[PDB]
Symmetry: D2
Amino acid sequence: AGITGTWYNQLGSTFIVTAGADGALTGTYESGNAESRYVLTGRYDSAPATDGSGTALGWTVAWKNNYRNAHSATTWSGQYVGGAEARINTQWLXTSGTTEANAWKSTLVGHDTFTKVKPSA
Amino acid sequence: AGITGTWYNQLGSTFIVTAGADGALTGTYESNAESRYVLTGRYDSAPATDGSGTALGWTVAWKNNYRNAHSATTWSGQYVGGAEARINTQWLXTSGTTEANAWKSTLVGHDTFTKVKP
Amino acid sequence: AEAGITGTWYNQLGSTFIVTAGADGALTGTYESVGNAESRYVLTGRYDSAPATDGSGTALGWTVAWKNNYRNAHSATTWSGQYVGGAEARINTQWLXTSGTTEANAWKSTLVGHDTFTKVKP
Amino acid sequence: AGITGTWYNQLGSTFIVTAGADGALTGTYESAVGNAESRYVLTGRYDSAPATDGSGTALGWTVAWKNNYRNAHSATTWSGQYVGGAEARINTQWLXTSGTTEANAWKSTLVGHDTFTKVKPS
């Protein structure tokens, strides 16, 4: 509950997601041209605690579509926090395909927060 | 592609995955049915053939019909083919927390998977 | 030349740290969760003392081991980040906290997160 | 021995460290990869009174990648623990942040993991 919808991060990328009754996340991630749209899939806790805790979840986008392939994939891990203004707070890992000699620089890390409203600025 | 099949991490877990032609990863992660969980993810279905690995990632939410830890792990990494084939990953586990505890919500670590047991 | 880093920084959760940025690249100071002694710990780290002039941030990092004369949590946090100058100067960081664990519990030894520090006590 | 000594990671970097009585780590880091040549200063902290229940010893340190030869405008922190034994090891995860503009801040930080032994691998 509450997860399905369109979400926007602080840099205005758009995460359109559906949360299925089974725990599945499915949808699209973009930033508005078709060439910038990618499939996403993930999982979320479909029976969260009832004590005030958020709902754990995660998803992946591989950065290949019909138009572009960056040979890389990002995973977001986080929790949905419901209520007045719902947010999803995440930290993410992007791994690029590398040779073994370059594997030490394969993975970037950062954090994104998503709300159902587009950001200002 | 080389990803579909059974993989083992270095600490007794088994990752059973099918890599679909559409770039999907689907499968299960275990350890016994009480210890088994659905996973889903995505991978680069057209990687480079220049010696670079194949990027990928997937998620397990730690709920099944028996147990629920109210947490989810994501793995981000690359498959490296060859005679000693491996999937090398870094992972983040986020637990559901209150706002006050959100600073201790996420563990980070790494896992290497191989096609034969440890 | 002024690095702009020396002084008192606050995150959005209470915590305060007081740092000196030495001419040799050193960061030295204290980190405190209110300001009582039992909440104060030694900080040490390093920063780039000749950053780029193209508008990029100044890379830096520091460590606090969570032991003082009063308490010992058997853990240490590192913050890795960059200072961004201006009227609203900020240090944006990602941090890792590692707790000492047995080998069996080593998978749950390290937490990760992010914090942003400003010069304005919130 | 303990933490003080010369350690090597899996990629052949050399970490020369002294663990002081007061919890200080000091020494030099020499990296086999990246925009890096010769030694760089490191400083950090460690738990100088660890648990006696078989846990490892929490520690962390930072290198800013500027020395008299090269400046990569970046810094790495390592957070981890020392695990004594027959083959003593320091297991860490690390974050490198590069100075970036605001537009590029999303790609400022790499993450990885290093394990160090007192014996050098090939």
